[PDB]
A paper describes a structure:
Here, we use a combination of structural biology, biochemistry, and phylogenetics to elucidate the molecular functions and evolutionary relationships of the three Fam20 kinases.
To elucidate the molecular basis of how Fam20A regulates Fam20C activity, we determined the crystal structure of the human Fam20A−Fam20C complex. The structure reveals that Fam20A and Fam20C form a reversed face-to-face heterodimer. The Fam20A−Fam20C interface buries ~1000 Å2, or ~5% of the solvent-accessible surfaces from each molecule. The various defects of these Fam20A mutants confirm that the dimer interface observed in the crystal structure is critical for Fam20A to bind Fam20C and regulate its activity.
Numbering used by the authors:
A (entry chain C): 159 to 187, 220 to 575
B (entry chain A): 89 to 526
Amino acid sequence: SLLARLFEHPLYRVAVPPLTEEDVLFNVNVDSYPNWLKFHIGINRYELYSRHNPAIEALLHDLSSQRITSVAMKSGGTQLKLIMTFQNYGQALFKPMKQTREQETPPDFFYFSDYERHNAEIAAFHLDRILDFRRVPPVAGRMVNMTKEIRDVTRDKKLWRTFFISPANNICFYGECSYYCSTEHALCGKPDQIEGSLAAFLPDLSLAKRKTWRNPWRRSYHKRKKAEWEVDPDYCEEVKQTPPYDSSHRILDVMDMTIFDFLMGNMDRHHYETFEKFGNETFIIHLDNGRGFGKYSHDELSILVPLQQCCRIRKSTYLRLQLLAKEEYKLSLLMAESLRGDQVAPVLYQPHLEALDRRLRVVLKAVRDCVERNGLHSVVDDDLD
Amino acid sequence: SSKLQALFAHPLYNVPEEPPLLGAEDSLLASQEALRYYRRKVARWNRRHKMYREQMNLTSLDPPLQLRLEASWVQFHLGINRHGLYSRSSPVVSKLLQDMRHFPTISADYSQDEKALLGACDCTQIVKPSGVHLKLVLRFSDFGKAMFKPMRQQRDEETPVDFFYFIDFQRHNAEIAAFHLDRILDFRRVPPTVGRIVNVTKEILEVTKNEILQSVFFVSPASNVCFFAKCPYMCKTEYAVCGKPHLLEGSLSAFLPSLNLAPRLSVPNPWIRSYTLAGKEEWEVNPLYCDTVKQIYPYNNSQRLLNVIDMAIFDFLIGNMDRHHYEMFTKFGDDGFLIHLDNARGFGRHSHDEISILSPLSQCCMIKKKTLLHLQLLAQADYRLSDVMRESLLEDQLSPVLTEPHLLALDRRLQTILRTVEGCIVAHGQQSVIVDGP
Ligand SMILES: Nc1ncnc2c1ncn2[C@@H]1O[C@H](COP(=O)(O)OP(=O)(O)OP(=O)(O)O)[C@@H](O)[C@H]1O
Ligand SMILES: Nc1ncnc2c1ncn2[C@@H]1O[C@H](COP(=O)(O)OP(=O)(O)OP(=O)(O)O)[C@@H](O)[C@H]1O
């Protein structure tokens, strides 16, 4: 009900502009379609899904319960990511458990050394949902049988040949990616089931190409090397005068993203993707959110530097971010409830839900530091039609 | 009070050892030759070190190194006799351990065994050779050396289940504890080992002449001086080993004499493991495996096989599955004692007893008379194995080196060894289950 009241609020019923044939993604010139397909044909210019869509909550149910028919390991490398095919032709990306729940990434780990936990992937969907951004593909947790749903249903000999039995008579496997894909990192169930996050598959690039931009606040991805924006305090004055980032609808998309990343601690947003058929005047897809929620006793302020430098925010999210701080609409109790139905719940160790609020007030206080230094009407854009 | 003193003051730890040593041919190092060799290595070090200081522009302050006979490692080397590595209740070893804990370091390298790998990272290799592991060799002001194994795990941490032996960690505290167990058993076979807290910057990085070793030191987002083994970090199989921010604790293991003075013989154990994710060796399946071993040279003399039995006991007490090879001193012959060099893996499961280590004793069913007496004694409460270990380990700067479940495991594992000796006595009699040789 605390969550049910959030969506009764008048900040969460502002509809998107009227759509036209050049604003949808898949013009349909549709009730037996699977929930993954309703999800695809509903992607418009300014969202990934509707606020009260019947398919998104049903697609979440599918990823958790639907039977798995084929599994394949992803191409190239970059951490262990598995593609799964269900009985309804639908696909989903899978990130296995890899790390615990009450655990923290050690302080001595750089941002490029961190794990990818299903926790952050599941949580990021709900957090992106509570903020009414709706820029993440739906993801649900699941307790997968690593025999009858991984090994015994894959023809990828590269994967299959890593399923070994452990000294503890447990079933292990490690795959063949680039980072953390050897026996010492082999994911192991007791005796034959781990958990992961089935992230729903975006539409195939065959019928929906997707741009991929380099975020101008990407880190050096190198020790002992700074990334310019760590040396220029008004580096944002250059980005507001670059090829596309000079448009008002674009300099803002990054702001909503960074407030998202800082709430989770995801300092690995080196690139972001558009939708091509949509050009430069759309939303930004929040993908690969697995490097968050790895620290609960730490708030990484370096993530928020894009907001501190540009000192601009959307009034849409500003009035939201305030409401999420009041105890009657608190991020803690809202997220903990939204994450109560995920089959893998509790998806978040409690102090992360608590930290989620502490991170909100430092974002909220950061807007105030921009508002008394640059004024109000020059920090908040307006949305009220 | 003090069960430890009671142990060494017992009639067992005092009776002369047979056969006695004539000398000269029962001290693996010849004095006049060894001093000349070491005196030359000291002269070459002084030369090639001053030149390094001149290239990097550093005033050659202080005099050059002096090789003194009174150094601990010197007297440690010249004291290695046919009866073991060190002497029983030796005052040199006490000084030796204290020296490795306090003397300053003057050099640090990568050791051979690495370095001789040339390349060589094969991120596909599951059991990469024992040269891609984090360990350095330090040199002290008295010219002595020591194999430094840094801390890799907390005290109350075990090798997680689903971890095979070949990927188990490399505990510094178990290198120390294995030495204290060695001295308590009067096996006298692993080199003396101390725990020490090392300023990784002042005592490793700032003293190494190796351009690669300087390249593996970095600083964390928490501002801690870290370093790493070049190969495992690239394959992402292990992490780094950071100070807090500079202070790091490790285990120094005293160096054996130089292989130019005392050659050694890396011999494959007869009970090696497969070292694969599957597949078992012959002994892992045939309870009559030792019937075969007893008929293979040089295990036919019935005196080398006994030394391996002692090793199996010592490894079972510490849970050291990874004993693929035992080294020997060639001067002492087929009957010479075995050196227990790298124990860094034992003491990783305090809740589990791996009986496959005891397979030599289980299947050969024969134990040395002396070894059985010390094991029987260490089962009696007045000198129980855990208490004499707990007390002996208190003399280390890294106390407590062993948590309580580990110490209590030694007692229980001792019963299993004694239960097997008495157990397989019933099938063979004290005739073939005790070898009271001199
Ligand atoms: N002047 C130098 N410039 C650059 N690198 C050097 C220099 N001198 C030595 N090194 C590197 O450091 C190491 C030198 O170690 P050190 O001089 O302490 O003893 P060593 O002679 O190499 O070893 P050992 O004592 O076993 O003969 C060499 O392996 C070499 O790679
Ligand atoms: N306590 C110990 N634990 C493990 N390994 C040891 C120990 N003592 C010696 N060793 C091994 O013995 C070897 C020492 O020989 P090394 O190649 O350093 O030549 P050296 O003995 O220094 O002789 P020189 O420098 O005069 O040629 C190293 O590979 C080291 O791994």
